[PDB]
């Protein structure tokens, strides 16, 4: 199996299997409704989500990168923000799609 | 020009041009020494850095994702942490390489 950061979720290997249960904790993933969790990149609107994912160059160019050495190991930390184009005619639908998946786990077991 | 998150830095379109100068503010990237800044993905050790960058699936699976509406526009926020494999024979070289680039800008004239 690939390193966690290189994994690709699909119906055969879903978001929970690849990335763990969604939840509220720092360094727990919070993104995905039940349909996306189950289907990963097989999700019918995956392209409209993936348009916001950074290239490796942009991940290392845009982000605040840190390194932490703790009792669990050595961790590369990252924070950043990606600006949506509010002049894109698809902007309202993009906001609706992203909001549908952000913290969706709070509404189901 | 591509949306910022899809840009690829190269010798012709470098990290400063693609992603802005390195600096300490939360809106700036902090990653890259003078050689990676000038070369982007032409950098001789780029693969050893890119191995830590998340797939589109992992970026949305591992990260804490948010949406912030501020005076400057609408932002998709991301945070998370990637564990190094201390059983990787290249672990000690990965630590040295990441230490060369994190906040390297502090040493520039
Ligand atoms: O990267 C740039 C911009 C380059 C550029 C612009 C327009 C062009 O048309 C072009 O071809 C290139 O400069 C910086 C910026 O903007 O302040 C960028 O600095 C550096 O890496 C400098 C490092 C350094 C290290 C050791 C030294 O001894 C020394 O003298 C300098 C940063 O700190 O992020
Ligand atoms: Na160290």
PDB file of C-alpha atoms and ligand atoms in Angstrom:
ATOM      1  CA  UNK A   1       0.000   0.000   0.000  1.00  0.00           C
ATOM      2  CA  UNK A   2       1.165   3.579  -0.935  1.00  0.00           C
ATOM      3  CA  UNK A   3       2.207   6.231   1.632  1.00  0.00           C
ATOM      4  CA  UNK A   4      -1.042   7.855   2.959  1.00  0.00           C
ATOM      5  CA  UNK A   5      -0.419  11.148   1.053  1.00  0.00           C
ATOM      6  CA  UNK A   6      -0.184   9.272  -2.322  1.00  0.00           C
ATOM      7  CA  UNK A   7      -3.325   7.137  -1.852  1.00  0.00           C
ATOM      8  CA  UNK A   8      -6.279   7.385  -4.275  1.00  0.00           C
ATOM      9  CA  UNK A   9      -9.717   6.596  -2.827  1.00  0.00           C
ATOM     10  CA  UNK A  10     -12.129   4.665  -5.145  1.00  0.00           C
ATOM     11  CA  UNK A  11     -15.255   2.482  -4.532  1.00  0.00           C
ATOM     12  CA  UNK A  12     -12.842  -0.516  -4.086  1.00  0.00           C
ATOM     13  CA  UNK A  13     -10.709   1.479  -1.548  1.00  0.00           C
ATOM     14  CA  UNK A  14     -12.891   4.222  -0.065  1.00  0.00           C
ATOM     15  CA  UNK A  15     -12.115   7.448   1.822  1.00  0.00           C
ATOM     16  CA  UNK A  16     -12.513   5.739   5.247  1.00  0.00           C
ATOM     17  CA  UNK A  17     -10.216   2.812   4.233  1.00  0.00           C
ATOM     18  CA  UNK A  18      -7.522   5.163   2.744  1.00  0.00           C
ATOM     19  CA  UNK A  19      -7.747   8.224   5.084  1.00  0.00           C
ATOM     20  CA  UNK A  20      -9.673   7.142   8.215  1.00  0.00           C
ATOM     21  CA  UNK A  21     -13.117   8.120   9.543  1.00  0.00           C
ATOM     22  CA  UNK A  22     -14.076  11.802   9.121  1.00  0.00           C
ATOM     23  CA  UNK A  23     -14.072  13.743  12.417  1.00  0.00           C
ATOM     24  CA  UNK A  24     -13.372  17.015  14.286  1.00  0.00           C
ATOM     25  CA  UNK A  25      -9.815  16.514  15.610  1.00  0.00           C
ATOM     26  CA  UNK A  26      -6.676  18.296  14.374  1.00  0.00           C
ATOM     27  CA  UNK A  27      -5.101  16.058  11.644  1.00  0.00           C
ATOM     28  CA  UNK A  28      -8.417  14.100  11.216  1.00  0.00           C
ATOM     29  CA  UNK A  29     -10.046  14.679   7.766  1.00  0.00           C
ATOM     30  CA  UNK A  30     -13.438  16.479   7.870  1.00  0.00           C
ATOM     31  CA  UNK A  31     -14.342  16.428   4.151  1.00  0.00           C
ATOM     32  CA  UNK A  32     -16.937  14.251   2.479  1.00  0.00           C
ATOM     33  CA  UNK A  33     -20.615  13.333   2.623  1.00  0.00           C
ATOM     34  CA  UNK A  34     -21.625   9.660   2.598  1.00  0.00           C
ATOM     35  CA  UNK A  35     -21.582   9.409  -1.230  1.00  0.00           C
ATOM     36  CA  UNK A  36     -18.041  10.889  -1.589  1.00  0.00           C
ATOM     37  CA  UNK A  37     -16.745   8.782   1.379  1.00  0.00           C
ATOM     38  CA  UNK A  38     -18.065   5.599  -0.349  1.00  0.00           C
ATOM     39  CA  UNK A  39     -16.874   6.440  -3.925  1.00  0.00           C
ATOM     40  CA  UNK A  40     -13.705   8.594  -3.537  1.00  0.00           C
ATOM     41  CA  UNK A  41     -12.438   9.584  -7.050  1.00  0.00           C
ATOM     42  CA  UNK A  42     -15.273   7.445  -8.605  1.00  0.00           C
ATOM     43  CA  UNK A  43     -17.601  10.213  -7.224  1.00  0.00           C
ATOM     44  CA  UNK A  44     -19.536  11.640 -10.208  1.00  0.00           C
ATOM     45  CA  UNK A  45     -18.581  15.306  -9.326  1.00  0.00           C
ATOM     46  CA  UNK A  46     -14.963  14.496  -8.333  1.00  0.00           C
ATOM     47  CA  UNK A  47     -13.516  16.715 -11.193  1.00  0.00           C
ATOM     48  CA  UNK A  48     -15.314  19.802  -9.722  1.00  0.00           C
ATOM     49  CA  UNK A  49     -13.669  19.067  -6.291  1.00  0.00           C
ATOM     50  CA  UNK A  50     -10.219  18.104  -7.701  1.00  0.00           C
ATOM     51  CA  UNK A  51      -9.979  21.502  -9.586  1.00  0.00           C
ATOM     52  CA  UNK A  52      -9.130  22.970  -6.119  1.00  0.00           C
ATOM     53  CA  UNK A  53      -6.417  20.379  -5.218  1.00  0.00           C
ATOM     54  CA  UNK A  54      -2.844  21.749  -5.521  1.00  0.00           C
ATOM     55  CA  UNK A  55      -0.064  20.445  -7.796  1.00  0.00           C
ATOM     56  CA  UNK A  56       2.962  19.259  -5.786  1.00  0.00           C
ATOM     57  CA  UNK A  57       4.722  22.515  -6.842  1.00  0.00           C
ATOM     58  CA  UNK A  58       1.805  24.655  -5.548  1.00  0.00           C
ATOM     59  CA  UNK A  59       1.509  22.571  -2.308  1.00  0.00           C
ATOM     60  CA  UNK A  60       5.160  23.397  -1.499  1.00  0.00           C
ATOM     61  CA  UNK A  61       4.966  26.938  -2.986  1.00  0.00           C
ATOM     62  CA  UNK A  62       1.739  28.215  -1.294  1.00  0.00           C
ATOM     63  CA  UNK A  63       1.692  26.384   2.048  1.00  0.00           C
ATOM     64  CA  UNK A  64       3.154  27.105   5.477  1.00  0.00           C
ATOM     65  CA  UNK A  65       5.336  23.995   5.961  1.00  0.00           C
ATOM     66  CA  UNK A  66       6.621  22.849   9.351  1.00  0.00           C
ATOM     67  CA  UNK A  67       8.288  19.829  10.921  1.00  0.00           C
ATOM     68  CA  UNK A  68       7.330  18.430  14.371  1.00  0.00           C
ATOM     69  CA  UNK A  69       9.139  15.598  16.196  1.00  0.00           C
ATOM     70  CA  UNK A  70       6.762  13.993  18.735  1.00  0.00           C
ATOM     71  CA  UNK A  71       6.345  10.650  20.524  1.00  0.00           C
ATOM     72  CA  UNK A  72       4.375   9.354  17.446  1.00  0.00           C
ATOM     73  CA  UNK A  73       7.152  10.238  14.961  1.00  0.00           C
ATOM     74  CA  UNK A  74       8.325  12.985  12.606  1.00  0.00           C
ATOM     75  CA  UNK A  75       5.520  15.007  10.931  1.00  0.00           C
ATOM     76  CA  UNK A  76       5.477  17.495   8.009  1.00  0.00           C
ATOM     77  CA  UNK A  77       2.753  20.017   8.885  1.00  0.00           C
ATOM     78  CA  UNK A  78       0.977  22.174   6.289  1.00  0.00           C
ATOM     79  CA  UNK A  79      -1.539  25.074   6.310  1.00  0.00           C
ATOM     80  CA  UNK A  80      -2.754  27.336   3.493  1.00  0.00           C
ATOM     81  CA  UNK A  81      -5.673  28.789   1.605  1.00  0.00           C
ATOM     82  CA  UNK A  82      -6.803  28.535  -2.040  1.00  0.00           C
ATOM     83  CA  UNK A  83      -8.780  31.536  -3.392  1.00  0.00           C
ATOM     84  CA  UNK A  84     -11.999  30.727  -5.286  1.00  0.00           C
ATOM     85  CA  UNK A  85     -12.673  32.826  -8.427  1.00  0.00           C
ATOM     86  CA  UNK A  86     -15.881  34.725  -7.445  1.00  0.00           C
ATOM     87  CA  UNK A  87     -16.075  36.015 -11.110  1.00  0.00           C
ATOM     88  CA  UNK A  88     -16.357  32.382 -12.426  1.00  0.00           C
ATOM     89  CA  UNK A  89     -20.013  31.827 -13.508  1.00  0.00           C
ATOM     90  CA  UNK A  90     -19.717  28.381 -11.749  1.00  0.00           C
ATOM     91  CA  UNK A  91     -18.647  30.025  -8.411  1.00  0.00           C
ATOM     92  CA  UNK A  92     -22.049  29.632  -6.584  1.00  0.00           C
ATOM     93  CA  UNK A  93     -22.198  25.897  -7.591  1.00  0.00           C
ATOM     94  CA  UNK A  94     -18.547  25.406  -6.505  1.00  0.00           C
ATOM     95  CA  UNK A  95     -19.340  26.948  -3.045  1.00  0.00           C
ATOM     96  CA  UNK A  96     -22.491  24.729  -2.731  1.00  0.00           C
ATOM     97  CA  UNK A  97     -20.484  21.569  -3.717  1.00  0.00           C
ATOM     98  CA  UNK A  98     -17.622  22.275  -1.268  1.00  0.00           C
ATOM     99  CA  UNK A  99     -20.074  23.210   1.606  1.00  0.00           C
ATOM    100  CA  UNK A 100     -21.993  19.935   0.976  1.00  0.00           C
ATOM    101  CA  UNK A 101     -18.815  17.919   1.907  1.00  0.00           C
ATOM    102  CA  UNK A 102     -17.219  20.188   4.610  1.00  0.00           C
ATOM    103  CA  UNK A 103     -18.151  18.636   8.050  1.00  0.00           C
ATOM    104  CA  UNK A 104     -20.943  16.539   6.434  1.00  0.00           C
ATOM    105  CA  UNK A 105     -19.923  13.685   8.854  1.00  0.00           C
ATOM    106  CA  UNK A 106     -21.595  15.666  11.754  1.00  0.00           C
ATOM    107  CA  UNK A 107     -25.074  14.642  10.358  1.00  0.00           C
ATOM    108  CA  UNK A 108     -24.559  10.830  10.262  1.00  0.00           C
ATOM    109  CA  UNK A 109     -23.040   8.062  12.443  1.00  0.00           C
TER     110      UNK A 109
ATOM    111  CA  UNK B   1      -2.232  31.736 -16.542  1.00  0.00           C
ATOM    112  CA  UNK B   2      -3.469  28.716 -14.478  1.00  0.00           C
ATOM    113  CA  UNK B   3      -5.250  29.176 -11.137  1.00  0.00           C
ATOM    114  CA  UNK B   4      -2.471  29.504  -8.472  1.00  0.00           C
ATOM    115  CA  UNK B   5      -3.099  25.947  -7.053  1.00  0.00           C
ATOM    116  CA  UNK B   6      -2.499  24.352 -10.540  1.00  0.00           C
ATOM    117  CA  UNK B   7       0.756  26.284 -11.291  1.00  0.00           C
ATOM    118  CA  UNK B   8       4.070  24.452 -11.789  1.00  0.00           C
ATOM    119  CA  UNK B   9       7.246  26.441 -10.933  1.00  0.00           C
ATOM    120  CA  UNK B  10      10.236  25.926 -13.345  1.00  0.00           C
ATOM    121  CA  UNK B  11      13.476  27.848 -14.191  1.00  0.00           C
ATOM    122  CA  UNK B  12      11.321  29.985 -16.625  1.00  0.00           C
ATOM    123  CA  UNK B  13       8.439  30.540 -14.155  1.00  0.00           C
ATOM    124  CA  UNK B  14      10.026  30.251 -10.715  1.00  0.00           C
ATOM    125  CA  UNK B  15       8.608  29.857  -7.193  1.00  0.00           C
ATOM    126  CA  UNK B  16       8.597  33.659  -6.599  1.00  0.00           C
ATOM    127  CA  UNK B  17       6.751  34.277  -9.943  1.00  0.00           C
ATOM    128  CA  UNK B  18       4.239  31.395  -9.432  1.00  0.00           C
ATOM    129  CA  UNK B  19       3.654  31.614  -5.627  1.00  0.00           C
ATOM    130  CA  UNK B  20       5.051  34.975  -4.375  1.00  0.00           C
ATOM    131  CA  UNK B  21       8.173  35.697  -2.288  1.00  0.00           C
ATOM    132  CA  UNK B  22       8.853  33.471   0.753  1.00  0.00           C
ATOM    133  CA  UNK B  23       8.113  35.139   4.100  1.00  0.00           C
ATOM    134  CA  UNK B  24       6.760  34.899   7.677  1.00  0.00           C
ATOM    135  CA  UNK B  25       3.128  36.049   7.121  1.00  0.00           C
ATOM    136  CA  UNK B  26       0.363  33.369   7.295  1.00  0.00           C
ATOM    137  CA  UNK B  27      -0.614  34.241   3.611  1.00  0.00           C
ATOM    138  CA  UNK B  28       2.976  33.614   2.295  1.00  0.00           C
ATOM    139  CA  UNK B  29       4.734  30.301   1.562  1.00  0.00           C
ATOM    140  CA  UNK B  30       7.849  29.710   3.757  1.00  0.00           C
ATOM    141  CA  UNK B  31       9.352  26.725   1.870  1.00  0.00           C
ATOM    142  CA  UNK B  32      12.455  26.704  -0.344  1.00  0.00           C
ATOM    143  CA  UNK B  33      16.141  27.643  -0.388  1.00  0.00           C
ATOM    144  CA  UNK B  34      17.627  29.915  -3.086  1.00  0.00           C
ATOM    145  CA  UNK B  35      18.196  26.936  -5.467  1.00  0.00           C
ATOM    146  CA  UNK B  36      14.608  25.505  -5.190  1.00  0.00           C
ATOM    147  CA  UNK B  37      13.124  29.048  -5.514  1.00  0.00           C
ATOM    148  CA  UNK B  38      15.059  29.661  -8.784  1.00  0.00           C
ATOM    149  CA  UNK B  39      14.529  26.143 -10.278  1.00  0.00           C
ATOM    150  CA  UNK B  40      11.055  24.965  -9.052  1.00  0.00           C
ATOM    151  CA  UNK B  41      10.405  21.467 -10.454  1.00  0.00           C
ATOM    152  CA  UNK B  42      13.783  21.627 -12.356  1.00  0.00           C
ATOM    153  CA  UNK B  43      15.388  21.437  -8.833  1.00  0.00           C
ATOM    154  CA  UNK B  44      17.826  18.460  -8.712  1.00  0.00           C
ATOM    155  CA  UNK B  45      16.084  17.028  -5.563  1.00  0.00           C
ATOM    156  CA  UNK B  46      12.463  17.910  -6.562  1.00  0.00           C
ATOM    157  CA  UNK B  47      11.264  14.226  -6.547  1.00  0.00           C
ATOM    158  CA  UNK B  48      12.464  13.783  -2.906  1.00  0.00           C
ATOM    159  CA  UNK B  49      10.314  16.839  -1.956  1.00  0.00           C
ATOM    160  CA  UNK B  50       7.312  15.982  -4.194  1.00  0.00           C
ATOM    161  CA  UNK B  51       7.088  12.502  -2.471  1.00  0.00           C
ATOM    162  CA  UNK B  52       5.467  14.368   0.496  1.00  0.00           C
ATOM    163  CA  UNK B  53       2.894  16.328  -1.625  1.00  0.00           C
ATOM    164  CA  UNK B  54      -0.669  14.947  -1.475  1.00  0.00           C
ATOM    165  CA  UNK B  55      -2.633  13.427  -4.378  1.00  0.00           C
ATOM    166  CA  UNK B  56      -5.943  15.267  -5.105  1.00  0.00           C
ATOM    167  CA  UNK B  57      -7.680  12.349  -3.261  1.00  0.00           C
ATOM    168  CA  UNK B  58      -5.325  12.573  -0.219  1.00  0.00           C
ATOM    169  CA  UNK B  59      -5.527  16.406  -0.136  1.00  0.00           C
ATOM    170  CA  UNK B  60      -9.343  16.232   0.346  1.00  0.00           C
ATOM    171  CA  UNK B  61      -9.151  12.942   2.380  1.00  0.00           C
ATOM    172  CA  UNK B  62      -6.436  13.836   4.963  1.00  0.00           C
ATOM    173  CA  UNK B  63      -6.912  17.627   5.317  1.00  0.00           C
ATOM    174  CA  UNK B  64      -9.076  19.777   7.571  1.00  0.00           C
ATOM    175  CA  UNK B  65     -10.978  21.741   4.883  1.00  0.00           C
ATOM    176  CA  UNK B  66     -12.821  25.019   5.556  1.00  0.00           C
ATOM    177  CA  UNK B  67     -14.351  27.960   3.725  1.00  0.00           C
ATOM    178  CA  UNK B  68     -13.669  31.586   4.878  1.00  0.00           C
ATOM    179  CA  UNK B  69     -15.454  34.677   3.432  1.00  0.00           C
ATOM    180  CA  UNK B  70     -13.226  37.766   4.075  1.00  0.00           C
ATOM    181  CA  UNK B  71     -12.878  41.274   2.503  1.00  0.00           C
ATOM    182  CA  UNK B  72     -10.372  39.774  -0.047  1.00  0.00           C
ATOM    183  CA  UNK B  73     -12.888  37.058  -1.239  1.00  0.00           C
ATOM    184  CA  UNK B  74     -13.841  33.392  -0.604  1.00  0.00           C
ATOM    185  CA  UNK B  75     -11.026  30.985   0.468  1.00  0.00           C
ATOM    186  CA  UNK B  76     -10.812  27.182   0.771  1.00  0.00           C
ATOM    187  CA  UNK B  77      -8.653  26.676   3.909  1.00  0.00           C
ATOM    188  CA  UNK B  78      -6.559  23.492   4.392  1.00  0.00           C
ATOM    189  CA  UNK B  79      -4.492  22.126   7.305  1.00  0.00           C
ATOM    190  CA  UNK B  80      -2.962  18.739   8.092  1.00  0.00           C
ATOM    191  CA  UNK B  81       0.112  16.709   8.906  1.00  0.00           C
ATOM    192  CA  UNK B  82       1.966  14.001   6.982  1.00  0.00           C
ATOM    193  CA  UNK B  83       3.943  11.360   8.914  1.00  0.00           C
ATOM    194  CA  UNK B  84       7.473  10.496   7.687  1.00  0.00           C
ATOM    195  CA  UNK B  85       8.233   6.726   7.546  1.00  0.00           C
ATOM    196  CA  UNK B  86      11.078   6.229  10.106  1.00  0.00           C
ATOM    197  CA  UNK B  87      11.593   2.715   8.517  1.00  0.00           C
ATOM    198  CA  UNK B  88      12.335   4.348   5.110  1.00  0.00           C
ATOM    199  CA  UNK B  89      16.133   3.908   4.641  1.00  0.00           C
ATOM    200  CA  UNK B  90      16.106   7.516   3.209  1.00  0.00           C
ATOM    201  CA  UNK B  91      14.482   8.979   6.443  1.00  0.00           C
ATOM    202  CA  UNK B  92      17.670  10.796   7.653  1.00  0.00           C
ATOM    203  CA  UNK B  93      18.233  12.289   4.136  1.00  0.00           C
ATOM    204  CA  UNK B  94      14.531  13.392   4.023  1.00  0.00           C
ATOM    205  CA  UNK B  95      14.953  15.211   7.389  1.00  0.00           C
ATOM    206  CA  UNK B  96      18.127  17.006   6.115  1.00  0.00           C
ATOM    207  CA  UNK B  97      16.447  17.984   2.804  1.00  0.00           C
ATOM    208  CA  UNK B  98      13.303  19.363   4.529  1.00  0.00           C
ATOM    209  CA  UNK B  99      15.443  21.274   7.137  1.00  0.00           C
ATOM    210  CA  UNK B 100      17.393  22.902   4.187  1.00  0.00           C
ATOM    211  CA  UNK B 101      14.112  24.406   2.776  1.00  0.00           C
ATOM    212  CA  UNK B 102      11.764  25.182   5.704  1.00  0.00           C
ATOM    213  CA  UNK B 103      12.162  28.946   6.474  1.00  0.00           C
ATOM    214  CA  UNK B 104      15.392  28.997   4.376  1.00  0.00           C
ATOM    215  CA  UNK B 105      14.411  32.618   3.313  1.00  0.00           C
ATOM    216  CA  UNK B 106      15.446  33.828   6.862  1.00  0.00           C
ATOM    217  CA  UNK B 107      19.130  33.381   5.794  1.00  0.00           C
ATOM    218  CA  UNK B 108      18.887  35.282   2.463  1.00  0.00           C
ATOM    219  CA  UNK B 109      20.654  38.705   2.432  1.00  0.00           C
TER     220      UNK B 109
HETATM  221  O1  LIG C   1      13.181  35.065  -6.200  1.00  0.00           O
HETATM  222  C1  LIG C   1      13.198  36.230  -6.370  1.00  0.00           C
HETATM  223  C2  LIG C   1      12.847  36.718  -7.786  1.00  0.00           C
HETATM  224  C3  LIG C   1      13.483  36.427  -8.915  1.00  0.00           C
HETATM  225  C4  LIG C   1      13.096  36.987 -10.275  1.00  0.00           C
HETATM  226  C5  LIG C   1      12.308  38.125 -10.453  1.00  0.00           C
HETATM  227  C6  LIG C   1      12.053  38.554 -11.754  1.00  0.00           C
HETATM  228  C7  LIG C   1      12.599  37.851 -12.832  1.00  0.00           C
HETATM  229  O2  LIG C   1      12.338  38.283 -14.143  1.00  0.00           O
HETATM  230  C8  LIG C   1      13.397  36.723 -12.623  1.00  0.00           C
HETATM  231  O3  LIG C   1      13.955  36.001 -13.688  1.00  0.00           O
HETATM  232  C9  LIG C   1      13.651  36.298 -11.338  1.00  0.00           C
HETATM  233  O4  LIG C   1      13.694  37.125  -5.407  1.00  0.00           O
HETATM  234  C10 LIG C   1      13.180  37.002  -4.084  1.00  0.00           C
HETATM  235  C11 LIG C   1      12.175  38.122  -3.815  1.00  0.00           C
HETATM  236  O5  LIG C   1      11.214  38.394  -4.600  1.00  0.00           O
HETATM  237  O6  LIG C   1      12.353  38.891  -2.852  1.00  0.00           O
HETATM  238  C12 LIG C   1      13.283  35.545  -3.501  1.00  0.00           C
HETATM  239  O7  LIG C   1      14.653  35.664  -3.119  1.00  0.00           O
HETATM  240  C13 LIG C   1      15.658  34.712  -3.294  1.00  0.00           C
HETATM  241  O8  LIG C   1      15.510  33.542  -3.438  1.00  0.00           O
HETATM  242  C14 LIG C   1      17.044  35.359  -3.279  1.00  0.00           C
HETATM  243  C15 LIG C   1      18.055  34.716  -2.669  1.00  0.00           C
HETATM  244  C16 LIG C   1      19.553  34.774  -2.335  1.00  0.00           C
HETATM  245  C17 LIG C   1      20.299  33.758  -1.744  1.00  0.00           C
HETATM  246  C18 LIG C   1      21.666  33.977  -1.516  1.00  0.00           C
HETATM  247  C19 LIG C   1      22.239  35.200  -1.900  1.00  0.00           C
HETATM  248  O9  LIG C   1      23.592  35.468  -1.695  1.00  0.00           O
HETATM  249  C20 LIG C   1      21.476  36.209  -2.481  1.00  0.00           C
HETATM  250  O10 LIG C   1      22.028  37.450  -2.888  1.00  0.00           O
HETATM  251  C21 LIG C   1      20.136  35.983  -2.707  1.00  0.00           C
HETATM  252  C22 LIG C   1      12.583  35.240  -2.152  1.00  0.00           C
HETATM  253  O11 LIG C   1      13.191  35.634  -1.112  1.00  0.00           O
HETATM  254  O12 LIG C   1      11.452  34.606  -2.024  1.00  0.00           O
HETATM  255 NA1  LIG C   2      15.411  18.173  12.577  1.00  0.00          NA
END
